[PDB]
Structure formats: structure tokens, C-alpha cells
RNA sequence: AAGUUUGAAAAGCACUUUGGAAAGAGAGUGAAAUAGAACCUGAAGUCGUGACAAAGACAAUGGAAGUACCUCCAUUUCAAGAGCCAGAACCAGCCCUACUGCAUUAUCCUGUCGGGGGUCAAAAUCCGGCGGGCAACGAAGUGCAAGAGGGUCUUGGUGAAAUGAGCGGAGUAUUUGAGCUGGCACGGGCACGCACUCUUCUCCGUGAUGCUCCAUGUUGGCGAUGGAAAUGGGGUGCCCCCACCCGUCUUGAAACACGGACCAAGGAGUCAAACAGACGCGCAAGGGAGGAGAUAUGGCCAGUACUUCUCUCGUACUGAAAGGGAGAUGCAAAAUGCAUCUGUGGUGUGCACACGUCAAAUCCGUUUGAUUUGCCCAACACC
RNA sequence: UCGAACCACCUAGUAGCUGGUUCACAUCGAAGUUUCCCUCAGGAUAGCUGGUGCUAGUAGAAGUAUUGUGCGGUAAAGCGAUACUUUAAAUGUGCAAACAAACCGGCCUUAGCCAACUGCAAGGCCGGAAAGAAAAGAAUUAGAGGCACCAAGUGGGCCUUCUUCGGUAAGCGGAGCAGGCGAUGCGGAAUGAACCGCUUAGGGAUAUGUGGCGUCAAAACUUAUGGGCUCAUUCUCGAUACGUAAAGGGUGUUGGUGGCCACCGGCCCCGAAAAUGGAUGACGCUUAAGGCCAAUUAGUGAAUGCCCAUUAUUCCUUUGGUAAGGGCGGAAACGGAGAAAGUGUAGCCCUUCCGAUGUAGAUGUGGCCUGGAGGUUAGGACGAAGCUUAUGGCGUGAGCCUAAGAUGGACCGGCCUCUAGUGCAGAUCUUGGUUGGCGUA
RNA sequence: CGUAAAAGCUUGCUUGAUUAACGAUUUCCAGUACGAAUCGAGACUGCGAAAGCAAGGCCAGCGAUCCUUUGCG
């Protein structure tokens, strides 16, 4: 035999298939599959790689955040470019939180109804990923953006909630019964807000 | 009836490894310190990004010139 | 053991081959071992004199 | 407990013959009597009978590999045929046995002189002087070694692209060693390190407009349509070898540890409600009811189609409570300051894209990696 | 029926305890230990395990060395008593060894230190250098770092090596370090959970390990052109470790030291006494088939006498990957056919490389089977379901399909979705029927 | 274990055995609590000419929820 002692912990796991029911997000994965094997390019690999995710794994972005992006990005351009296609494997939705937006190109996944408003009221243009196919086949010129995922309730709530240093927020739903002996210091103790490491 | 013996810790311990210490830069956190010499560095640092929001003008104003 | 493989893997190894059947040949071993004799011989009398 | 479920219909077995009778043997009805009255189908287990196979005591059962006999089974071959079974040849590969030199010998080999030894006398074993040296046909059993005949029932094939020192074309030379030859190194001269005659065969060639699979020799035996031949499967016996009784608790079961006569049918993670994570689907700063109504609508129709204004979860948290309640930049220092509003509060690490460089390969126009600078998405760390 | 009658009901009372728990293959794979508990036949908790991933694929790597630099009071040594201690190992153990780091010079800021700052402390900005770590034995890697989420089983252990504490001792109790069995066969030690060798997809060939080569029993058909030693009469010479006899004697025989003596060896013999008949495994063996040493066909002249594994090398086939490459615009014409942009199939097709055992436990499967619903597509009086089998064929398997009935007489098969009172060998299981004992008592 | 112009003895003055904005840490350890302990920032002080030293007697000497009771605004 061969001493392999512990050779199975070195086995990653990574998904080789969609588990998604969707016809067209099936026709996207053939082509952008496609794409990936016979270019060169790096954009096209990661879109292949962010279409067969899961769903809680492509998070949704905000129109506000693609904004301030932009720009940021834009302030430094030569003036004489465009400005890049802004495409993100996911869903879009909109801000009421900001007014005003320039006009952009945004390719994605689905767009809500009122940000494909203001998208196109604001001199713009929403693009699906086939059309992009076509535009720029190898990706260049594109800005690839993802959505948050700190934030959620469930990420919140992870860990125990009892241990020094913790913040993490426990599962209960009376909000004042969980509030005495553990949680002040006129009670027997209190959890320390803070740990060093 | 109270066993005690440490036989087999070691190779339970061992499969996963004995992990190495976090590095020295990550989670250096000050809370706890000396307090005069913390009370003068936050008046530094302040400072500090005060110089960097400025720097960042003026590099975007030079770009826009030239 | 191959013929093929181990000429495609060294080129050279005729050239070896031909000097080993040159060495194994008779007369050549004969006068190479009478001719060396008496050059070492020879050559200890008059170096340790 | 117990389906009366014979059959379409009682057409529910006249008559003869044996018997005390029950019944039997014939005859008859019916499509059917192996549908004859508790009568559709009629399993398993157990038992009778006929034929056959064997077989000691080796408990029986079981595994593997053959053979004898059988086979209501399958499949393939019968004439120019490759079907089945043999034998030999050749090619590729693999595996075995063939064919072999260089260093080192000195505590050694050899001749004399003297000693010492011993014999019936002289030789040798042994020691010390100095003269030579190779124990050199298998001399070392010392160190390191390079040099086509036999198998493939251990593989694939018979040239349907044979890449070969091995198949082809062209000549006779090429260059490997061994001897012997003319600055620096090596030692106190060079045993022949570094640089500039013998001994062997050399150079050239077949891309895939073939992505994949399968189809190609020679000589006999058997098979000419049959109660055929052959291969495979099935059955039973035999021989050699191997082989403790299942389930369970237990550190430990073949156990003198518990349950275990046979068969049929039944027999054990379910339904509801609250919460969570992962995965699928719709919409998104919003999502969604429920109850109820309205009209298509008055077996189809307990379904499907439509609906307000409400309710609920969320977009904001914090304090025991009275209560209060979150942008950025610049000026400034007001215990409710002022001004602008295309905007990541900052720093470190950090996809893709853009701008240049470097290295490797390439009908060579481009790839595969590394790296500088800009912006850095997600995310983590410190503020 | 009485140390509290009988009948029905609450009641399927509760049980940390005993018994049971129904198909196949594939990828992985434990623990008997920590802390708390009216806690010791139970839990919760961490660890060990599976699944799911996230992230910029060589990164912040290591049960191992080297070099530099720290820690230690055990073994040994010595002298309280008549083992405490100056000294002090081997085996250990902490840190470092150039890419968010460190070195060399501008400068900014601080309501930090100092009598003061051109010094010191801290945070930054601008530049330089960079054998990217030489030479001196001057590392190596079947060397991709980090970060989460959800959850199972387990919480009775036992054996051995080297240390040991209690005990007269124990197949006894308690511990330290490592390896095992439990959860595991296979090849050896005649036999044995744990010893020796080796660790496992389905098969060939070659060669080995431990152990062997008189017969049983494969191998020296009792090898050698090797040397010594040994004779043993009712359990008896002896002869495979782990594993089940002492003092003292002996002219039995073989040798060694010092002076025919005294002492020390090798084999053998007394010392050596139990309960069914019996054990180098049996027979037997003595110019051994015993015990110590040494060979490989033998002073000839040159690396391997022989036999046996689920190991090693190699060849064929399967299956799965953290897998690695290539082809897939029908070239044209007319030996054969095919050629799907693809998790999973009768796998879209080729080529290549590596792994494959496993109790409790996790997960996967265009994986198998049963009753009913929505669709679709078929069959049946020229014979549906059910039943029978030396009826073959297919599949690793759960199973599927055909044949024959000298069986039956009216219903029913495939495929995609939906649904459940959905798979039996055992529970002193339930109900029905059989059965040996038995033509016996 | 440690300590010699002391950490022992005598003596003078004292109350740091107070308060200490929910600072950080060690031991047990699940890296929870309790008990004990270490390094601190602020107030008010003690002793000393000064630098300094001191928030008990180094290291064992102690205790949740609910209820009772006192202080504080
Ligand atoms: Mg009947
Ligand atoms: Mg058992
Ligand atoms: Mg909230
Ligand atoms: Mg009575
Ligand atoms: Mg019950
Ligand atoms: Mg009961
Ligand atoms: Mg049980
Ligand atoms: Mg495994
Ligand atoms: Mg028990
Ligand atoms: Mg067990
Ligand atoms: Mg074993
Ligand atoms: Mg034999
Ligand atoms: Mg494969
Ligand atoms: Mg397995
Ligand atoms: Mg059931
Ligand atoms: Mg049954
Ligand atoms: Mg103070
Ligand atoms: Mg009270
Ligand atoms: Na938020
Ligand atoms: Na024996
Ligand atoms: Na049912």
C-alpha cells in the first residue's frame, strides 16, 4: 500500500452544475461556457464561474452604489474613452435614497421595474447578457460589480451570543425577555463587550 | 467509575492540525493601552486623514488640468 | 534493452559501442596490457631515482 | 368465526353393472366436471407414487476449479463458405539467458648467503642479510563495469496511414576508442589531466481533406440441413483443496451467554404547530395575506377568474422610565453656527478592466505566466 | 381472585431500563476523553466525523532537519541518616532566519518625554537599495493559504513497548509517551482479538517478506567436493521467539588459565513427587531429520540453490476524481456505420494520470421495487391479472425481459410528473394452517 | 520560595484596609462564571529633605435567580 495519511482533507468542494429550474439561465450557461473555453480572456471565466451559484450567493446591488462607483472610477479617465459597461450577474434595484444619477450602460441579470425607470429616464440603457455577447465578446472595457451580503439578518445572528466579545444577536421573538441575569452587571454578571483576539 | 488517561489526545488533536498563531499585523488593536500616549496618536491620526482628503483634491484637480 | 529507444534517448551510443568492441577486441587488449605495463614500470624506476 | 364467488342457463349426472350402505366402474349434460354443490382461481409447507442418480461410517449445508452423464434452453455454422477446434510461420512489445573491460596486487613471487631444524643421510616448515621482479591460461574468487538464442493458452496483430541501427533509397567514406605524437596543471620526473597502426558502417525519406468505431494471413480436423456439428448456459454425481452457528449486548462469542420446529398473510420515524439553516421559485424598500364580498355562476362548480381599505412582517434604534432619535465636504468653534449637494469618512490587504514592462514558447499573430501604475467590486483588519 | 375482591372507565398511565426496527451500489469515516449537573446504566458542553460552501490557486504551510539565541534540575555523580545537594546529561522545549516585514536620507503633524531641540516616542508622506538572500556540508516536501454555516455517532474500553505508584503476588488496581485491537481480513508462529510479515477494486505473469526445504506438505528426488560437539534405559536427550526449575554435585566427554595440580567454560547426567490414555503438532530421527557457526553447486578461475502472500513490478478490465488534454461550421466523391457544446443514461466521441478494505455515523444516485392521481403512448377471447419452472437472455446489484404451461378466464403494460397506511428472517411478535416425536406414552 | 545599612527588631507620624468614569489581563477554562491575582487612568490623601513608596497583612481564608433590607438621585 501507499501511506496517503490525511490525502482527503486536501479534497475542495466546488459546483460543477446549476441546481436552478430556469430554461434561459440554462441558455446563458451554455453559451458563456462556451465563451470561457475558447477565449483567453479572464472576464469571461469569472461569468461563467458567478452563473452557477446559488441564489443567496449573488446578492443584489443598489442603483445608488453603482453610481458612486462610476464615478469614482470615471474621475480619473482620459475624457476621450467611454465609460465602461457596468455588468453584474445578479439582480438591480432601485434607490430612493438618491435622485439624480448620470447616464450609464448596465447589463445584468433582471432589473426591478422602477430602476429600469430611472435607468432609462436618466439617458441610459439596461442590456441583457446575450446583447453584451455581441458588444464586447471578450469583455473589455467592463466594470464587474457584486451586491452586499454583510448586512442580512441571518450573518447577524451567527455565533453564540453569550461568549466575551460577542455581538451576534440571538434567536428569540419576545424582545424583552432576554434582557437580565447574563446581560447586566446588577445581575450576577455580564457578558464582556470585548476580547482581545 | 472516574476514568482519567490523556491516550488518544494527542493523535485527536493532530488531525486537523495545530494551527499557527494569527500574524503579528492582523487584529492589533490598542484598547487597553497607556492612555496618554493613545489620546496622542488619535490627534495624529486625525490629522492624517485631513492630509489624505486634501491630497486627493488636489491630485484630482491636477489630472483634470492636465 | 531497446534498440530504438535507446538511440532515439542518446544519439551518441554507437560511438560508445564501437569503442567497447574496439577494447574487448584481442590483440588490441594484448598489446594495450603489455605496451601500459611497461609504461607504468618504467616510469616508477625513473620517477623514483 | 363465517364472501353462499358452481354455471350464461340446473341443463344439479336418466339408465346399466358391483356393493348392506357410503361409494366405485361405465354412460350422459355442459364450451369446460382437474366447474359435481359450500363446487372461480387454487400458492407455500407437508405427504403418496413412478422413473432416475448415486452413496460407507467422514452431520448436513457452503467456496473454488475440473470431469462423467444428461439437457422440452439459447446462439452460430454447413462448400467455398473462415463457424468451431487444432499446428506451424512472420511482425511489434514485454520478459529470461548469451556475448565484458578497467584499476589494485609488496604482510607477495623468485635467487643466493648465514642461522635454525630434522633425518638412516638432505630437503622442508621458520628467521635475518641483498640480487631481481607480473604468482598473469583461465593469477586473485579485490572495487567499479558499458559487451543476437528461449517464452508469450503472461499481450496485440497479418500491414485498412509498419517512423524502424530493424522498412526503404543513395557510397565506401564518416568518426568512436586504443597505441604513438608537440603551453598550464601534478609530484620530488610525468603513471600520461586541461586547451589547440589496429579498431567500427554512414547520409536521406512517407501528416491525419482519416473526428470515432468495425471490417485483411497459412495448413489440417469437424460440419453437405440433421433425430447434425459446435460454443455458451442449466441439472445431478464424483475427485483434490478450502471452510466453526445465525441475530444480539459486550473490551472480548463457535461458546457450557440470551432468542431461534416449518409455511402463508399482517407488522415499527408518522400527522400538526413554533423557530432555524441549506437549496428552488416570484417580487423588491417594499413583500404578502387572512376573513369576507362580487359576478362568470344560475354532474360541470368544494375548482378557476376578480377585489377594496384594512392587518401583518420589514425600511431605526435606544432608555427601568419620563423621553429622545443617526449623510459628506469646506470655513469655523455656535451648550439648534454658516455655505455647497454628480456622491465611496480615512488607512492597509484585495476580482475584473485600462495603461506599460519582463520571461517563456509559436506560421510567428498570438498565447501561457510574472510584475508597475490607476480605479478598486465583494470581503477582512485598524481607526 | 386478598399485607386491600371483582367489573368498566381515566388508559395507548410514565419508563435515564429490556426486546424489535423491512431494497441495492457509490464517495467518505469515528469515539470511550475535557468542563458543569441529587451528576455515575443519563444529559448538556468542547474534540474527533460528514455535508454545504466563501475567498485574489502556491498566499499567514509543516507531529522533520540546519544555524543563532533562551528555558530546565531527572539519570549519573556526592555526602542527612550514620535519601538532601553545589555539578550535571541523553531524550525535550520557546523564538528568529527579507514582499502588509526589515535597512538608508528629506519632509509634515502631536493640547507626547526632556531645561530646550537639529535629541527621543508615535502616525504618515517623498526618495534609495535589494547576491530577493553569495561562499563556508549551508535544507526538504505525492509543499494552494485563510474564513464560515448546518448536523450525526461517541462520553463502559482493552492489549503491548519503554517509564513507573499501591500491593506478598495476580490473566490485580492507578498513571506517563507511542503503537495497536475494538472497526480487519490476508500470509506465518500446529492452535490463540492484541505476536511476526503485510495492510485489502475484478483477473493473469514475474519477484519477494515473515517462515521454511525426511514424510504428512510446495521446496536440498535425505544439497555440499564445510568445521566442531552430543548418547539421553516408564512424563524425558534435543529441536520455531512472544509463551506454560534453583543451589549443589559427576573423571561422562570435549578445552582453557595460571602453576600432575587448583580454578573457569561447552554439551550430557543426578538434584526433579499426583490424580481418564496422550503428545518437539503426529510419525520418526542419532555418518541427525539435534545444538553453535558458515556456504550456494565449491582453493575452478568471478553479484541471484530452492518454495509459499489480497505486498512489490508489470499487463488487461471496472469504478470514482480538487482529475488533465483533444474533436464536434458534416473535406470532396460514393468498404460500412456513427459524430448530442454535454453534472447524472445504453455514459456525445477519443486519449491520458492517480485512488479504491471498514463497525457507529453522514451524504449521492436520468439507482431498483409496491398501491392510487394528472398526462401521453400501447396491448387483450388468435386469451388480461394471478400462479408454476434443469425457460434462457440482460444487469457489479436491487431487479428487468423473453419462452413453455398438456395453467387461468377479463382486464392491463411503458414513459414524464403528483401522492402514500410503499419493500421483513428473527420482536418468549399477531392470526390461520402444517409438522418430527408416534402407531409411541 | 525570598530577604541583612532588610522583607527581621525598636521607634516617629498616619488610615492607600477610602474612592476609583462598565480600561486591559492571568489562573480554572468551554478559553463561561465565581474566588484569588497582575499592569493601569482619574480624585482625595499618608510618610519622606528628595527620588519614591502605599488603593491591606504576596501566594488558602469563600457564594447565583427570586425575596427581605439599607445607602444614593
Ligand atoms: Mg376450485
Ligand atoms: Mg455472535
Ligand atoms: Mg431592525
Ligand atoms: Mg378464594
Ligand atoms: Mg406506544
Ligand atoms: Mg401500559
Ligand atoms: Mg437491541
Ligand atoms: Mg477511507
Ligand atoms: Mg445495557
Ligand atoms: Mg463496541
Ligand atoms: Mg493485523
Ligand atoms: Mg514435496
Ligand atoms: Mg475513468
Ligand atoms: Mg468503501
Ligand atoms: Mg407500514
Ligand atoms: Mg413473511
Ligand atoms: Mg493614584
Ligand atoms: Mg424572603
Ligand atoms: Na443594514
Ligand atoms: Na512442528
Ligand atoms: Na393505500
Avoid at chain 1, 452544475?17 to 440554462?26: D, F, L, R, V
Avoid at chain 2, 491620526?45 to 484630482?60: F, V
Wanted: include cysteine; charge should be positive; glycine fraction near 6%.
Amino acid at each position: 500500500g501507499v501511506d496517503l495519511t490525511g490525502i482527503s482533507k486536501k479534497s475542495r468542494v466546488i459546483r460543477h452544475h446549476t441546481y436552478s429550474t430556469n430554461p434561459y439561465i440554462k441558455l446563458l450557461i451554455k453559451l458563456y461556457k462556451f465563451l470561457a473555453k475558447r477565449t483567453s480572456s479572464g472576464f469571461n471565466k469569472v461569468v461563467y464561474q458567478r452563473l452557477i451559484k446559488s441564489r443567496s450567493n449573488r446578492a443584489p446591488i443598489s442603483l445608488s452604489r453603482i453610481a458612486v462607483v462610476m464615478k469614482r472610477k470615471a474621475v480619473f479617465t482620459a475624457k476621450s474613452k467611454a465609460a465602461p459597461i457596468a455588468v453584474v450577474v445578479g439582480d438591480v434595484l432601485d434607490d430612493v435614497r438618491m435622485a439624480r444619477i448620470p447616464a450609464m450602460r448596465v447589463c445584468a441579470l433582471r432589473f426591478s421595474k422602477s430602476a429600469r425607470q430611472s435607468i432609462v429616464a436618466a439617458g441610459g440603457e439596461c442590456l441583457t447578457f446575450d446583447q453584451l455577447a455581441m458588444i464586447a465578446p471578450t469583455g473589455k472595457n467592463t466594470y464587474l460589480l457584486r451586491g452586499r451580503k454583510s448586512g442580512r439578518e441571518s450573518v447577524r445572528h451567527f455565533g453564540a451570543s453569550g461568549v466575551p466579545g460577542s455581538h451576534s444577536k440571538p434567536y428569540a421573538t419576545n424582545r424583552g425577555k432576554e434582557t437580565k441575569r447574563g446581560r447586566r452587571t446588577g445581575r450576577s454578571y455580564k457578558r464582556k463587550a470585548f476580547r482581545h483576539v | 467509575s472516574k476514568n482519567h488517561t490523556n491516550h488518544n489526545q494527542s493523535s485527536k488533536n493532530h488531525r486537523n492540525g495545530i494551527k499557527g498563531p494569527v500574524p503579528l499585523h492582523l487584529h492589533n488593536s490598542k484598547r487597553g493601552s497607556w492612555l496618554p500616549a493613545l489620546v496622542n496618536a488619535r490627534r495624529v491620526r486625525k490629522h492624517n486623514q485631513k492630509a489624505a482628503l486634501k491630497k486627493r483634491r488636489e491630485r484630482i484637480a491636477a489630472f483634470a488640468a492636465k | 534493452k531497446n534498440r530504438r529507444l535507446r538511440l532515439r534517448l542518446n544519439p551518441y551510443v554507437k560511438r560508445e559501442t564501437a569503442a567497447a568492441k574496439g577494447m574487448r577486441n584481442v590483440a588490441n587488449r594484448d598489446a594495450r596490457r603489455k605496451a601500459k605495463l611497461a609504461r607504468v614500470t618504467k616510469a616508477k624506476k625513473a620517477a623514483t631515482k
